[PDB]
DNA sequence: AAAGCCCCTAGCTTTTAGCTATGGGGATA
DNA sequence: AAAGCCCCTAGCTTTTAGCTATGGGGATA
DNA sequence: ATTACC
DNA sequence: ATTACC
């Protein structure tokens, strides 16, 4: 199962971490259900598909599916900051002792269908 | 086993395969040999790690990981497109039978330690 | 120590913001 | 038909080149 | 204003 | 000028 752009033939699937500033444990209650709907809006505005999704207290989980040419990095900027402009407006406590929302960093790991032992098996490597 | 740059730790293996123009298989002998250099040396210039690297006449495949800030697409646009100018100067096969060596094309598949399938069941399970 | 904390610039969105950049500099303990 | 074929612009490297761009148009017939 | 998700 | 890469 394999996507396109005009030049591309893609499956560029990311597990997405990333964690609130000083991990906070506020990705609890409205925060995190508001908080999958502007993610879930940003992805359909960037046509990048949510595979999975899901919060765990004071970090979060996504698998997303990303043009390559699009940039994996450019959907997380607007991920974390729209989230980061929105979820401060809606929720004071969001800038009570909480310079930002997100942090600077976050954690990126490529998966496909076939695991990483299985797909070197497809190249005889000449290195 | 993670890297890191300034912001990010990441993990960002792509299996990355394109072909020459008309499928040609012209990814024999001398040329083989010199397009495997070359990628080597835009690898190295360029923070990639080649995992495999295989040509088989009509193709090559490539595992690699690339910093996901930096853009797999870099890393290809910089390997097709030096490898396409210094092999049509060394080989004049490549540039009087050919308008280009490669296409616009390729075709990038990540993939890491975990199936899809499972790193799927494991974030959906995430809050008990 | 760093990804995560503090500090800095610049770029681009979310712009009397708040995230990135194959981005930089630190102490704390 | 498209990723792959022919055409284009525009950005950046490899620059009296040749690749990208979440880029566009099209015929094959 | 932090302390760790893979 | 192509026809498909575990
Ligand atoms: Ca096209
Ligand atoms: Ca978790
Ligand atoms: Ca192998
Ligand atoms: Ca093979
Ligand atoms: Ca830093
Ligand atoms: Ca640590
Ligand atoms: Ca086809």
Redesign the pocket.
């Known amino acids: 199962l394999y996507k396109?752009?005009?030049?591309?033939?893609y499956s560029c699937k990311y597990?997405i971490?990333?964690?609130p500033?000083?991990?906070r444990k506020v990705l609890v209650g409205a925060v995190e259900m508001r908080l999958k709907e502007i993610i879930q809006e940003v992805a359909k505005e960037?046509?990048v598909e949510i595979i999975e999704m899901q919060t765990?207290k004071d970090?979060i989980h996504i698998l997303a599916d990303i043009?390559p040419?699009?940039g994996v990095?450019?959907f997380?900027?607007?991920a974390?900051?729209?989230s980061?402009?929105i979820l401060?407006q809606e929720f004071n406590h969001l800038k009570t002792?909480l310079?930002?929302?997100?942090?600077?960093?976050?954690?990126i790991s490529t998966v496909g269908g076939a695991p990483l032992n299985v797909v070197k098996?497809?190249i005889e490597n000449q290195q």
């Open positions: 396109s752009n005009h030049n591309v033939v597990h971490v990333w964690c500033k000083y991990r960037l046509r765990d970090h043009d040419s699009f990095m450019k997380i900027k607007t974390k900051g729209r980061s402009r401060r002792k310079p930002t929302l997100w942090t600077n960093s976050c954690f098996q497809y």
